Write a protein that binds this ligand. Structure first.
Ligand SMILES: Cc1cc(-c2ccc3c(c2)CC[C@@H]3O)cc(C)c1O
Ligand SMILES: Cc1cc(-c2ccc3c(c2)CC[C@@H]3O)cc(C)c1O
Lengths: 11, 234, 243, 11
């Protein structure tokens, strides 16, 4: 899990 | 990949349009700063800027064509270089000072407020001076910041990234040719610009060690996101 | 100002003639490695290479025009980058291995014998692999190595005359850029391909800086552990970075 | 004082 993952997938 | 089909002028327009905003510091008016207050302001600002950086990177032509894991790798490798080249860029019109935010303009004496910060301040100020002496243009700046993003982590993984990098090179030369530089002036300026990226790398690695030391010193809690980007270097 | 009068072809000949030799280690292959012993071989070798590097630097055009203080500063900043690019260069034709010495060719599995070396080992291998895929030429290598010497410390140099020193260094750097373009145009590359390859080569210097920064932290770690012998010169060079 | 100074000096 990574915050970076979420930010990159989100807008 | 749509990035390779763009003209130089289209590439410049896309990168200029992708630019993140300039954020403000929390409007703490209390001067001078302490170590903990300056650290609080800078880490809070860095953390908010990181969110905008990630969304800027998605708008760099060619970056979305990479897989998620490759995007993660490049941003984990380059994030502090990118924050730093952005800080140096906006500090160009403030010789001798670092414009961390419009309401947070600091000189090198204020760098001493944080243990180990003044060495990094001096390197950032030196980079800003070099940009100013070269009369670095905003169009050149956006090319260099995108080069950092694609280049810094690419040797720790490729062909697609190198083609985009080649396209940004073409775009830098195109800008210089438009400004009336002769062929010899063009390749000399291209080298001068790209050699500063080696100094930005050095500053980032020095800054990463300093952030790690502030982490261990535990003066201020770092955000989970800042810690995740920091942990990717240790 | 001898450096400013050289032609591209004369710059290359000067740099080629100044090349330091490739030195041997004390490696004895009739016994298995160990962390302390392997690192002792490498630091012994690096110390001996450093002496040759210091005398090579004197032969890089323009370097002798600088002040002694500025020569010291540039070498203090650049020495590990220069050792590393040299290592990567002589390892080019040995895929998967680092040729530390003619009698010492290691793959990443043996480099794991030292704690934390494996990451640096992998980065050096990746750099050697990149030089191979670019087919880096010996003439281009000596140009890059001289760029590292003049560039890596220049941005950490007060005075109107102080600007003359940096400006002279930047004019020499400019001459080496001229020399790289000359070599590529002679090799048949179009204008576009020349600028592309120039950029590709200079961007590798960002990775060499990164490896040197990491290697310097690892060197400081070895000093603290006080297990591998480090020479007096290596310790002085190391201390110049933790200033 | 520095060895590097001396090696750069030595002739
Ligand atoms: C705590 C800390 C922060 C920074 C830093 C913080 C914020 C920002 C930048 C660098 C660039 C622009 C942005 O505003 C650097 C070091 C070394 C630090 O130790
Ligand atoms: C990680 C590391 C590498 C080296 C090093 C790097 C490159 C080379 C040598 C040693 C000897 C042959 C070659 O020139 C040295 C120290 C102190 C290091 O800490």
């Amino acid at each position: 899990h990574k915050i970076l993952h979420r930010l990159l997938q989100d807008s | 990949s749509l990035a390779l089909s763009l003209t130089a002028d289209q590439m410049v327009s896309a990168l200029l349009d992708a630019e993140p905003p300039i954020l403000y510091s929390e409007y703490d008016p209390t001067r001078p700063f302490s170590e903990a207050s300056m650290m609080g302001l800078l880490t809070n600002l860095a953390d908010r800027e990181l969110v905008h950086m990630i969304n800027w990177a998605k708008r760099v032509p060619g970056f979305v064509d990479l897989t998620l894991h490759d995007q993660v790798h490049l941003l984990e490798c380059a994030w502090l270089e990118i924050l730093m080249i952005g800080l140096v860029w906006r500090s160009m019109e403030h010789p001798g000072k670092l414009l961390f935010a419009p309401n947070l303009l600091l000189d090198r004496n204020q760098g001493k407020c944080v243990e180990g910060m003044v060495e990094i301040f001096d390197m950032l100020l030196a980079t800003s001076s070099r940009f100013r002496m070269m009369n670095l243009q905003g169009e050149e700046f956006v090319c260099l910041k995108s080069i950092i993003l694609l280049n810094s982590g690419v040797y720790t993984f490729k062909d697609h990234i190198h083609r985009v990098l080649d396209k940004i090179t073409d775009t830098l030369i195109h800008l210089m040719a438009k400004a009336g530089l002769t062929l010899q002036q063009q390749h000399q300026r291209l080298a001068q610009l790209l050699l500063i990226l080696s100094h930005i790398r050095h500053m980032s690695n020095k800054g990463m060690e300093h952030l790690y030391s502030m982490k261990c010193k535990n003066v201020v809690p770092l955000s989970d996101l800042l810690l995740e980007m920091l942990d990717a270097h240790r």
